Amino acid sequence: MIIVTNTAKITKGNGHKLIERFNKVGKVETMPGFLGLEVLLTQNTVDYDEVTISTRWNAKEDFQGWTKSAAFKDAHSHQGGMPEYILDNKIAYYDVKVVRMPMAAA
Amino acid sequence: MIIVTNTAKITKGNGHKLIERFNKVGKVETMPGFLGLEVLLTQNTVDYDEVTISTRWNAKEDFQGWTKSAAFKDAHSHQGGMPEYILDNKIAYYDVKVVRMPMAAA
């Protein structure tokens, strides 16, 4: 299982703009091996906003299949390029090593 | 929903030691409002290992309850210190803004 994160440093007060663009049903959630997408807003960022888009996959080749897909070309098409309010964008890959679920389900 | 992360930079080749310490049933899983813990290893870090412990909570008050609990206190009773391979540690808090679950492509 892997997580892929896209972390955007954003001009203060503009984080909501990037959140809005992901706050809809899309195509990535129809991809094989997709396990979920979440958008996070970092707390206590003083002079900037920080928005993280993270997707979880059963394996890296499942993510790679999406990035080569047709739907990936449409979802990254009429996007107005990199907006003015994005100061930096970092992508990272993570291996999931341990998962510990609550007792309220176990 | 919030996520609390603790990200440790660790001497390259020693990341497995922190992961192993979290690879067991603990007490945070018994806390009300707890939604899950995972341990991540960042891919393609050159000079160090990076291990992230993530806990997910229904609300910030649930995490606060945990940090006030006798369990949390006992789990940090150690007055000794820190293993020499732990180089840095940063805590971050996140508000979950969007969750997109898998959908059938039909």
Q: Per residue in B47-76, is it b (16+ CB within 10 Å) or e — as a string?
A: ebbbbbbbbbbeeeebbebbeebeeeeeee
Q: How many C-beta atoms lie closer than 10 Å to residue B80's C-beta?
A: 6
Say what the alpha-carbon torsion angle B12, B16, B19, B24 is, to the nearest 10 degrees: -170
- Cα–Cα distance for residue pair B20/A54, rounded to 1 Å: 25
Interchain pair A19, B98: CB under 8 A: yes
Listed residue (B90, B17, B86, B8) closest to B52, CA to CA: B8
Q: How far apart (Å, rounded) are the C-alpha atoms in residues B49 and B11?
A: 6
Interface check B91 vs A, CB under 8 A: no
Contacts of A23 in chain B (CB under 8 A): 97-98
Structure tokens, A51: 């928005």
The Cα B101–Cα A30 span in angstroms is 9
User: Distance (Å, rounded) from C-alpha A106 to C-alpha B25?
Assistant: 12
Q: How far apart are CA A78 and CA A7, in angstroms?
A: 21
Domain span including residue B55: 1-106
State the smallest CA–CA distance between residue A1 and chain B in angstroms: 10
Domain count along chain B: 1
- Kindly report the three-state secondary structure assignment for every residue of chain A: CEEEEEEEEEECCCHHHHHHHHCCCCCHHHCCCEEEEEEEEECCCCCEEEEEEEEEECCHHHHHHHHCCHHHHHHCCCCCCCCCCEEEEEEEEEEEEEEECCCCCC
Resolution value (Å, 1 decimal) = 1.9
Taking CB atoms and an 8 Å limit, are B43 and A92 in contact across chains? yes
Chain B touched by A42 (CB under 8 Å): yes
Task: Judge whether A51 and A18 are in contact, CB under 8 Å.
Answer: yes
Look up residue B99 and give its two tokens: 């969750």
Strand partners, B57: B2, B34
| Contact predicate A38/A32, CB 8 Å | no
Across the interface, which of B40, B97, B102 has its CB nearest the CB of A36?
Answer: B102
Contact A42, A52 (CB under 8 A): yes
> Would strands A48-57 and A34-42 be described as parallel, antiparallel, or unpaired?
antiparallel
A39 closest CB neighbour out of B41, B44, B98: B98
What is the distance in angstroms between the Cα of A58 and the nearest Cα belonging to chain B?
A: 12
Instruction: Please name every residue paired with B56 in a beta bridge, in sequence order, or none if there are none.
Output: B3, B36
**Cβ neighbours of B94 (radius 10 Å):** 22
In 3-state terms, what secondary structure has residue B35?
strand
